[PDB]
């Protein structure tokens, strides 16, 4: 029987590439999404056309709230309902916007940025572990630039740092259960689709390896390594996939 | 005019030592507390007996909620109300208890551990900056963040977020002359509930003296960071751990 | 045409595992060795029996000296002489023994430990780059460098310098399409001189399975980094330690 | 009795500021130098004018060689010969120049950069420890930008990384002897006198805190803290003094 994976925020970009590569590797996938219903459903449809009943969709807001634990439990439950198992969890879903220190209220900013990047990964990790030849692991999507953060992105940065702490803490604690916990950390490496080419060029020019952004597929490559049998001794590790960007001084 | 400092969770232990050393250095202090009302007022009394009108208390729950921003705004406001200025913020208050992955609901555990260790520090930093000499913030971090205690994920996540805040705020507040730094104890004043046998186990692990840090030793690093001897230092976290984080399993 | 790889200290243990896995992936290999001539030739024989003319041996002392640069240039040269190209360099060869601060002279200890772990990797990196597809260098680092073994200062300094080389060379060789990465074991194949009781002590420290890594497991991470699956990865060091570095004292 | 300190490369700049501040604090000082004989003697004169018999000079090349262990032993011995004790060692002396991967031979480059920045610190640490209410410590001058290195400075960077490892290893090992081992890490924060003012300004403009370099005094301030009784529980710590420079992404 085929293993199953949950990928949060899997409708687009890096999450989509991860879900696709897991599927191509033989995984059945839960495609979690928030707002991108059309994209998520069309992805699941494409994957199911490839192999019957190997993809399902699951909608959840991962903003922090008192119902977030239940939402995360339900995401994991959806994998068990659909496929009878859950082997891999990929914490990809993420809010990303500036929150300067000096329309959204600050409590909403906190809830979205810390919720998506840190608390939901924690609760999903809890639910994943509680519900557990096999090769069980979690991959957290981190950020290679966390020590050299984007100006005015404190809450985002705090969230990604907490995600590092979660990766380490969970690796330590879940090791007895055979659950490995690792991370993949892109740099400022695949720029937002809205951004102008000229603004994208400012970042690209800074990347030592090829003066270009990573493809979503290149990020997904590191995720599939970490979930694979080639990484069976690897836990608590975060792989930078940044083309040398974090090595470049101001 | 004397400068003024806010120290969160200042009624006992390390927070108390920080507040005392700041006061001894000439600062007027806001002693924030949560449940330790008697201890907090006792300390304020002692400091005011030393120099009149140089200490006030301020009660606030630092658990995450939709009113945490208001509570943090009020803590900073209380410093301006009492002393007309706020020069130093010390983010000391912290919940610390295990939250295994496998009586408190998980929602509550998240709110207390992430709230106290990370979100409140953020909101206090915001309010501090907004309300603005030698201005700085010191965050009480943790030297063992990369070698965490078993089953302390939420606490560890909070302290990691605190590192990210220290860096992010240092970067962003530098143009305003506000320095943001951290002090990271390994083992200092051990928990009150911890038995002497378990305390001795931890003490035995420390290379420098086989003993825990005094609260005063931790405070010493805090007062260096706030002092004029640290005027070019921002985004730095000073370990004060007697070599504990250097010891392999 | 098949790509070619240089693996230093490849006659046994992790170096052999790396050479073997590269060969199985389709690489022609230079098996560098120092004292293990019989093991190195035996390995080359086995690989050549599998595919004709795909393995050669190369002997060199990688102790620091004024001729180390020439020795390292010759190792790289031997790859070009044998295979007409050099696509991958694996810096595996390493001296490892205690050097307490309080038979070998200290100058010899410095020369061997810093030479093998740091200076030779640097000189090999220089010669590799100057002689220049999917080109990359993999440095064998150490996951425990921030939690070092007691009285292993020179070894530890060498491994830290190897981190700096990994970073510096990644930055500088990126314009040439040469990626530079590392693999950091915690405990893998334990020293042959180590008694089984001491080996079991180390094994028990490992959260993931209470066991050391096989050489193959280390080699797996090396082959990932050299592969097309790692084409955007440079300046990264992958821990392969089963969580060892996460465990506090 | 006054405590005594060895400061390597103390004739100029940061080393000089350190020597001066230690002296002002009540230390007797050994002023080590390499080529700056006039500056070293002039400093010794100035300090002895202040308090008689509190400063001596010691010349040594700290380039790696088979005679380096003896040279380092003699530097420490000079403190004991002059002052009868040695309480503090400051590893400040440092070669700093580019060594591209693609007049000096590479073996000389290796000897100078790795010798001054790492091997000599190690040998001096050995001799210091062997020769031992007291407050013994070593302060190593590190570099805040070691993870974001200057282009083509690989040997320098390797040296500074090795200095980090020495700081940690020696802290662990010398703790039982009451010898603390710490570091102070400036950024690109006090620029080379040979650098043109226009290039200096490019670097100054990068520093978030004040858009300016650190004074040598400010670096010395951190050294003074670490040697003081206010740092009695601090060992294996490296204090960045970089005005936020290392926090700034490319
Ligand atoms: N792109 C980069 O260069 C880069 C750099 C560093 C780190 N990373 C990390 O890598 C991961 C993937 O990056 P990306 O750029 O592909 O991400 P992205 O497109 O910006 O967002 C990924 C998904 O997160 C989901 N999301 C946002 N808010 C949510 C919420 N409140 N509840 C549930 N889901 C929510 C969104 O789902 P819907 O579309 O369905 O609404 C979105 O599609 C992220 O964790 C990111 O932080 C990326
Ligand atoms: N002690 C150590 O060995 C050690 C080690 C590493 C890091 N640290 C860090 O150093 C700092 C001080 O340590 P410590 O041992 O002195 O701390 P602590 O005694 O455990 O706690 C300090 C104060 O935090 C306040 N606090 C707890 N929950 C709160 C809440 N929900 N809202 C508002 N305040 C709350 C408490 O105030 P009330 O009593 O008034 O209720 C308490 O007095 C902490 O940030 C800690 O994480 C300490
Ligand atoms: N084993 C572990 O648990 C572990 C843990 C952390 C890191 N690592 C790293 O992973 C790598 C492989 O480990 P390992 O245990 O397989 O290594 P190893 O057996 O201790 O040494 C590998 C080879 O290094 C060569 N070597 C030693 N001194 C040399 C010199 N002066 N000149 C030239 N070659 C010299 C030897 O070649 P000859 O036999 O031909 O003389 C030896 O076979 C090393 O870099 C190591 O530091 C290993
Ligand atoms: N300047 C900065 O912004 C900065 C940044 C990061 C780190 N640091 C670190 O801070 C420390 C002081 O910096 P700095 O700029 O003041 O240093 P510096 O002026 O470049 O050099 C300090 C001294 O090192 C000595 N030296 C050089 N080569 C030597 C050799 N082969 N043998 C013995 N001594 C030798 C020289 O002594 P003589 O003059 O007597 O010949 C020189 O005066 C250094 O360790 C440096 O790496 C500085
Ligand atoms: N560029 C960029 C992004 C970074 Br840095 N972190 C991110 N996180 C999310 N979720 N999306 C993004 O586009 C990015
Ligand atoms: N021992 C201990 C403590 C650590 Br580690 N982190 C802590 N945080 C708080 N707040 N209190 C404590 O006693 C401790
Ligand atoms: N055990 C072990 C070893 C470590 Br840790 N680093 C090493 N380096 C080499 N070269 N050999 C070894 O056996 C080990
Ligand atoms: N700017 C600058 C310098 C750095 Br970064 N590291 C250095 N090291 C030495 N020795 N001298 C210098 O001027 C500098």
Q: Identify the structural domains of chain C with CATH numbers, from first to last.
A: 1-249 (3.40.50.720)
Task: Measure CA B76 to chain center.
Answer: 15
Structure tokens at A169: 């803490």
CA distance D108 to C75: 21
C5 φ, ψ (degrees, to nearest 5): -130, 140
DSSP, collapsed to helix, strand or coil, labels residue B136 as strand
Q: How would you class A108 by CB atoms within 10 Å of its CB: exposed for 0-12, middle for 13-18, buried for 19 or more? A: middle
**Half-sphere exposure at residue C199, Cβ-oriented, CA atoms within 13 angstroms:** 12
Question: Nearest 5°: phi and psi at B32?
Answer: -75, 145
Tell me if C191 CB under 6 Å of ligand 7.
yes
Active site residues of D: 156
Choose among C23, D168, C107, D79: nearest CA to B246: D168
Helix axes B106-114, A120-131, angle to 10 degrees: 140
Cα–Cα separations (whole angstroms), residue D159 to A31, C122, C163: 48, 12, 11
B155 catalytic per annotation: yes
Q: Could you identify the residue written with the tokens 């975060």?
A: A238
The approach used to solve this structure was X-ray
Interchain proximity C119–D114, CB inside 8 Å: yes
With CB atoms and an 8 Å threshold, state whether A244 touches C170.
yes
Distance (Å, whole) CA A50 – CA A21: 13
Q: Rounded to a whole number, what is the largest CA-CA distance in chain C? A: 54
**In this structure, which long-range contacts are made by residues D46-51, counting pairs with CB atoms below 8 Å and at least 24 apart in sequence?**
D47/D19, D47/D20, D47/D23, D50/D23, D51/D23
Residue D24's Cβ-side half-sphere holds a number of Cα atoms within 13 Å equal to 11
Token digits of residue A68:
């977030």
3-state secondary structure of B13: helix
Q: Does D149 touch chain B (CB under 8 A)?
A: no
Whole-number Å distance between alpha carbons of B196 and C30: 59
Contacts of residue B125 in chain A, CB cutoff 8 Å? 101, 154
Q: What angle do CA B146, B97, A153 make, to 5 degrees?
A: 55
B119 vs A96: CA distance, rounded Å: 17
Give me the phi and psi of B106, to 5 degrees please. Answer: -60, -35
Instruction: Give, using CA atoms, the residue closest to atom 1 of ligand 7.
Output: C190
- Can you tell me the distance from the alpha carbon of B74 to that of C83, in angstroms, rounded to the nearest whole number? 73
- Identify the residue among A150, A201, A249 best suited for mutation to test binding to D, counting D beta carbons within 10 A and taking the highest: A249
For residue D49, the surrounding DSSP H or E stretch is helix D37-50
Cα–ligand 6 centroid distance for A178 (angstroms): 29
Contact of C222 with C18, CB cutoff 8 Å: yes
The residues near C144 (Cβ < 8 Å, ≥ 6 apart) are B248, C186, C241, C244, C245
The first and second tokens of residue C31, run together, are 């098996």
Residue nearest to atom 19 of ligand 1 (CA): A13
Nearest-atom number in ligand 8 for the CA of D186 is 5
Phi, psi (5° rounding) for residue D127? Answer: -60, -45
Quote the CA–CA distance of C141 and C121 in Å, as a whole number.
Answer: 11
Query: Which one-letter DSSP state was computed for residue A21?
Result: H
β-strand partners of A238: A183
Contact between A234 and C233 using a beta-carbon 8 Å cutoff: no
Helix, strand and coil percent figures for chain B, each rounded to 5 = 50, 15, 40
* Cα distance between the two ends of chain B: 51
Among B28, B39, B37, which Cα is nearest to B3's?
A: B28
Other Cβ atoms less than 10 A from the Cβ of B85: the count is: 17
CB count in 10 Å sphere of residue C103: 3
Ligand 7 centroid from CA C157, angstroms: 14
Burial B18-50 (b: 16+ CB within 10 A, else e): bbbbbbeeebbbbbbbbebeebbbebbeebeee
For residue C67, what is the nearest residue in chain D, using CA coordinates? Answer: D107
- CA–centroid distance, A229 to ligand 1, in Å, is 27
Q: CB-side exposure of A141: number of CA atoms within 13 Å?
A: 31
Token couple for D86: 């040695």
- Nearest-CA distance from C188 to chain D in Å? 21
C-alpha B197/C-alpha B179 separation (Å) is 40
Breakpoints of chain B, after residues (C–N > 2.5 Å): 102, 132
Structure-token pair, residue C164 = 């700096």
Map tokens 């608590």 to a residue: A236
Please work out whether the CB of residue A94 comes within 6 Å of at least one atom of ligand 5.
yes
CA C62 vs CA B183, C69, C101, C211: distances in Å = 42, 9, 23, 31
Task: Quote the CA–CA distance of D247 and B172 in Å, as a whole number.
Answer: 10
Q: Which atom of ligand 5 is nearest to the CA of A192?
A: 13
Helix boundaries (H) for chain B = 13-25, 37-50, 68-83, 106-114, 120-131, 153-173, 196-203, 215-226
Interacting residues of D3 by C-beta distance below 8 A, sequence separation 6+: D26, D27, D28, D85, D87, D88, D134, D135
Spacing of C-alpha C15 from chain mean position: 7
H/E segment holding residue A46: helix A37-50
What amino acid positions of A are annotated as catalytic residues? 156
CA distance D98 to D119: 19
For residue A181, what is the DSSP state? E
Distance of CA A46 to the CA centre of its chain: 21
CA angle, residues D35, D40, D42, in degrees to nearest 5? 135
Rg of chain D on CA atoms, in Å = 17
Helix A68-83 / helix B106-114 crossing angle, nearest 10 deg: 130
Judge: D172–B207 Cβ closer than 8 Å, yes or no. Answer: yes
* Cβ-based contacts of B151 with chain A (< 8 Å): 173
What is the DSSP-derived secondary structure letter of residue B1? -
C partners (3+ CB pairs within 8 A) are A, B, D
Q: Is D27 helix (H, G, I), strand (E, B) or coil?
A: coil
Distance CA(C230)–CA(A217), nearest Å, equals: 11
Looking at beta carbons, which residues of chain C come within 8 Å of D118? 114, 157, 161
Provide the chain A residues 172-191 that lie in CB contact (below 8 A) with chain D.
Answer: 188
| Per-residue tokens: B75 | 């803590």
Q: Which of D214, D235, D237 sits opposite B232 (nearest CB)?
A: D214
Pocket of ligand 7 contains residue C190 by CB under 6 Å: yes
How many CB atoms sit inside 10 A of residue C52's CB? 8
The strand pairing partners of C7, in sequence order, are: C31, C90
- Among C27, C155, C176, C232, the active-site one is C155
Measuring from atom 36 of ligand 4, which residue has the nearest CA? D9
Ligand 2 centroid to D45 CA: how many Å?
51
Cβ atoms within 10 Å, residue C209: 16
The token pair at A128 is 């994943």
Please give the backbone phi and psi of residue A58, each rounded to the nearest 5 degrees, phi first. Answer: -145, 115
Among candidate residues B117, B125, B14, B128, the one with its CA nearest the CA of residue B62: B117
CB of B244 within 8 Å of a chain C CB? The answer is: yes
Grouping H, G, I as helix, E, B as strand and the rest as coil, residue C104 is coil
Q: How many whole angstroms separate alpha carbon A209 and alpha carbon C226?
A: 15
- Nearest by Cα to C64 from C27, C98, C21, C108: C108
Substitution target in A99, A169, A236, A238 with the highest count of B β-carbons within 10 Å is A169
Residues 6+ apart with CB under 8 A from C83: C2, C4, C28, C30
Q: Are C115 and D115 in contact (CB under 8 A)?
A: no
Cα(C40)–Cα(C92) distance, rounded to whole angstroms?
14
Provide the β-strand partners of residue A57: A31
Name the maximum alpha-carbon separation found in chain D: 54
């Amino acid at each position: 029987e085929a293993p199953a994976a949950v990928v949060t925020g899997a409708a687009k970009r890096i999450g989509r590439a991860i879900a696709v590569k897991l599927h191509q590797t033989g995984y059945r996938v839960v495609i979690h999404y928030h707002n991108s219903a059309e994209a998520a459903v069309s992805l699941a449809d494409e994957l199911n056309k490839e192999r019957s009943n190997t993809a399902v969709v699951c909608q959840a807001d991962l903003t922090n709230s008192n119902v977030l634990p239940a939402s995360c439990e339900e995401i994991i439950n959806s994998c068990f309902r659909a496929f009878g198992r859950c082997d891999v969890l990929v914490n990809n879903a993420s809010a990303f916007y500036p929150t300067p220190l000096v329309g959204k209220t600050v409590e909403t900013q906190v809830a979205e940025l810390i919720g998506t990047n840190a608390i939901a990964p924690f609760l999903l990790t809890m639910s994943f572990a509680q519900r557990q030849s096999s090769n069980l692991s979690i991959v957290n999507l981190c950020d290679a630039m966390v020590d050299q953060p984007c100006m005015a992105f404190s809450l985002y940065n705090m969230g990604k740092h907490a995600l590092v702490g979660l990766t380490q803490s969970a690796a330590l604690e879940l090791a007895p259960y055979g659950i490995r916990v690792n991370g993949v950390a892109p740099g400022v490496s695949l720029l937002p689709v809205a951004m102008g080419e000229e603004e994208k060029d400012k970042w690209r020019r800074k990347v030592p390896l090829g003066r270009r952004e990573a493809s979503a597929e290149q990020i997904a490559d590191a995720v599939i390594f970490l979930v694979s049998g080639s990484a069976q001794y690897i836990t608590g590790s975060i792989i930078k996939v940044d083309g040398g960007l974090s090595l470049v001084h101001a």
